[PDB]
Design a binder for these strands. Sequence first.
DNA 1: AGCGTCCAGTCTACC
DNA 2: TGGTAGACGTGGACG
Length: 261
Amino acid sequence: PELPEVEAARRAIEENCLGKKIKRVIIADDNKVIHGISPSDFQTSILGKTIISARRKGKNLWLELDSPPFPSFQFGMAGAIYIKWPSKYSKFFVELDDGLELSFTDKRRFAKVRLLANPTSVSPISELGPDALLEPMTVDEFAESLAKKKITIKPLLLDQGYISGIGNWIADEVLYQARIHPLQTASSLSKEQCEALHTSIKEVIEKAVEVDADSSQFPSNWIFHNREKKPGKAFVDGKKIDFITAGGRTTAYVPELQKLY
DNA sequence: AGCGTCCAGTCTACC
DNA sequence: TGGTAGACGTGGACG
C-alpha cells in the first residue's frame, strides 16, 4: 500500500484507539516479518501500555506509546491494518481495554514489524525523504530539485529517499494527469511540466486520502481504473494504454498524451 | 479446495 | 552514474 492506504490506517487508529490500555497482545511467530525481536518479547513489552498517538511517514506507520519502545510497520506490498480473527495473516494483534481490536496483516509476508525506541532516528524512517502529504515541496523547490536529477522521472518518484509516499500506481496516475512520459529525464523537464506534476501529485494524493484509499471512490477518469487490463485491451477515454517497465515496475502510460524529446 | 500460469515494496548483485 | 534484472513468500485472478 502507498501513502493513501497507510494514511487511512493512521487516521483510523488516531480516531478509535488513542488513550486505551493494551489488555491482550499476540504477535505472529513469523521469523521474516517480526524483525529484531521474539514474538514473545515483543508481546511482553507493549502489554499493558497505552497508545498515545499514531504516527506516519511515507509508507511507514508506528504507534507512539506511553513509554518506549514503539511498534512500527513497514507495509511492503501487502501490509494492511484492521480495526474491530486474529486473522490467519495477522502479524500484530492487540485488544484494548474496551474490547476494540487492532490488527496488522500481511498475506504476502513482505512487511516489516519492528519494536524500536525511536523509529524516527533509524532505518528505514531515518533515510526517508520529505513526506508527500506532510512536507510538500513548494512549487519552486520541487522543480529546483527536479533539475538536479539526471534520472528518469518515474523511478525518481518511486524513490523513498527523494520523496516518500508515492507508489507504483500513484506514480502512474500523476505522470498521466500531468501528461508526462515516465521515461522523460528529471532535469530535462520544463518548469511548466514541473509545475504540472507538482499539481497532479497534490490532486491525486489528497483525493485518495480524502476517500480513505477506497479505490472505488477514485475519480472515474483516473488511469488507475484500467491499469489492470491486459495489453492490447487497455484504454482510457478512447486513448490506448502501453505497458513498459521502469524502475523494475510495470508502468501504464498513454503514448498519445505522454510524449518525450 | 482440486490445475497451471501470471501479475503483484524493498534490497542486493552487477555491468 | 543510474539502469537493470532478479530475489524475496505467497494470494488472487483467470485461461
